[PDB]
Amino acid sequence: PHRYRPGTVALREIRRYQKSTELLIRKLPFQRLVREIAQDFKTDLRFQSSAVMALQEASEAYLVGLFEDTNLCGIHAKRVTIMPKDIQLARRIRGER
DNA sequence: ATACGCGGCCGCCCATCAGAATCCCGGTGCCGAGGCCGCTCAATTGGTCGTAGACAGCTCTAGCACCGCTTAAACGCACGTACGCGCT
């Protein structure tokens, strides 16, 4: 009986997932969340279904980029798994915040 | 030939006059608001025309809601491997 050796599945997908364009985040929950905050400035406002996507794309890509910076720093240390600080470390250096 | 005298020397406590050092009052240099000001060219003033844009009417897209059949994706847990990370 058989189970793939660790780290054999993850890379395979990386690429599969790298080749394609299609969004990873969910249409319903995303939307609800967007509505949640927008209400908190002013309550009960509307957006064209696309207007929601416009918003959805700009952030989905945004993370994937940060994860990439997080990874280099994980590597720089002789490590293998993106730890917390690395993200923060990354955040601090970019000096966005 | 043999015995007495003393002489400046000196430690002693005791006296006089100048110099060192702290406190009572100080001048000096640096920084930053002030004042002065004056020739003047950019804002203000009084004024006309016209056009953006507020506004009200209107219609006509699309954002919401809502439902249920279908199912892919998320979930949670079980088991172990191969890394995080600690030490030397």
Side-chain angles (χ1 to χ4, degrees), chain A residues 57-97:
Chain A
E57 175 68 23
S59 80
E60 187 284 339
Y62 167 94
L63 260 49
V64 180
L66 171 78
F67 292 157
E68 171 295 326
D69 288 345
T70 298
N71 201 11
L72 295 150
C73 292
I75 295 160
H76 178 260
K78 197 166 97 58
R79 236 180 315 105
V80 157
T81 297
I82 56 117
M83 294 300 293
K85 44 217 191 210
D86 283 10
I87 284 189
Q88 298 179 333
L89 160 89
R91 191 171 60 257
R92 296 287 175 272
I93 61 104
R94 185 177 296 180
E96 253 291 297
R97 285 220 198 151

Side-chain angles (χ1 to χ4, degrees), chain A residues 22-37:
Chain A
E22 170 275 330
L23 277 186
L24 289 187
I25 313 167
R26 295 176 64 186
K27 193 154 73 157
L28 188 147
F30 184 83
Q31 187 189 164
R32 293 182 183 174
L33 187 49
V34 173
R35 306 295 172 91
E36 181 281 332
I37 292 80

